[PDB]
């Protein structure tokens, strides 16, 4: 149950999400989604929702990467401008 | 949405909570309530709701607080008898 | 307000579930589409892992029990869990 969103990241510059570390059953330590904060980009398409798995987000993959790594990662990418696409696996 | 709950304490001993920090993609992070056990003191109040962060305990600023820290002062103000106040943002 | 679920592990081979260190123990993070614990719905987000199979969660860091989950659903045969509601 894969579902790839991508944000043109026009209307907003920020995607609007929260990010906590967590460990599935799979053996790594994957990146979830939190929360979902009114007004940003991910809120506006609604496919993500809290409880989904962030895999990969533009080019940079997310599967073992560890709460602390993600949430710069994100907030790096957040910067830049032009679209961002999450890939995501659906709770 | 702030909610300022105060709990007496009494049929409870624990507040039957656990914490998580969430970092977002606009540089602010934040200690969140993760789960409500039932049967606690928390969920027998109702109010707390899982995903509300949380601001305020007694006396105690957890705003910019690390986890691990904050599970030490909710631990020690746990510790102690008499009511406890939790200031939560929805 | 304890629960044991037994999962027959037949119709899935994964639980789809992701777990969290939490503290005043490992909680239920959340639960994927297409696996086990979702088809059997009893499990929900929030609830606090107590014993997989043999082994107890109550006093495991994340790094134990992200690895004995890893090692029991590569084993045959049911899984029951034990949790405490949310």
């Given at each position: 149950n894969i579902?790839?969103?991508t944000l043109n990241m026009?209307?907003?510059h920020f995607l609007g999400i929260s990010i906590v570390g967590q460990s599935?059953?799979?053996g790594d330590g994957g990146i979830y989604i939190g929360s979902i904060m009114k007004g940003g980009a991910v809120a506006?398409?609604?496919r993500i929702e809290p409880g989904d798995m962030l895999l990969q987000?533009?080019?940079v993959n997310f599967e073992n990467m560890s709460n602390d790594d993600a949430v710069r990662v994100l907030r790096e990418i957040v910067s830049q401008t032009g679209p961002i696409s999450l890939t995501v696996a659906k709770a």
């Open positions: 579902v790839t969103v026009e209307r907003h599935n059953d799979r506006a398409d609604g987000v533009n080019d």
